[PDB]
Amino acid sequence: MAMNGTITTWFKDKGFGFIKDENGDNRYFHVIKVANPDLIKKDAAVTFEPTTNNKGLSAYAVKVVPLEHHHHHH
């Protein structure tokens, strides 16, 4: 459950985006399902577990690769 991919579309207003699976499956992940802060996003690299729409399989512990920089907020 540790695969690499990239963000193809992102809806920050809706709090999720779309990522292409190594398996060729195009599926969406939610900022809540991301282990890294929802305040940190970048399309240049993601690591995630394979999943489907929330009608079948669920997703959790998604990791987005940082740019060696972050900020702390309340």
List the helices and strands and how they pair.
Blueprint: E1 3-5, E2 7-11, E3 16-20, E4 26-30, E5 46-48, E6 63-64
Antiparallel strand pairs: 1-5, 2-3, 3-4, 5-6
Protein name: Cold-shock protein
Organism: Pectobacterium atrosepticum (strain SCRI 1043 / ATCC BAA-672) (Erwinia carotovora subsp. atroseptica)
Domain CSD: 2-64
Q: How would you explain this protein's 3D organization?
A:
By secondary structure, the protein is mostly beta strands. The protein has one domain: Beta Barrel (OB fold (Dihydrolipoamide Acetyltransferase, E2P)), CATH 2.40.50. Helix content is 0%, strand content 31%. The protein contains no helices and 6 strands. It has strands at 3-5, 7-11, 16-20, 26-30, 46-48, 63-64. The protein has a 3-stranded antiparallel β-sheet, with no helix packed on it. A 3-stranded antiparallel β-sheet has the order 2-3-4, with no helix packed on it. A hairpin with a 4-residue loop joins strand 2 and strand 3. It is globular, with a radius of gyration of 12 Å. This is Cold-shock protein. It comes from Pectobacterium atrosepticum (strain SCRI 1043 / ATCC BAA-672) (Erwinia carotovora subsp. atroseptica). Residues 2-64 form the CSD domain.
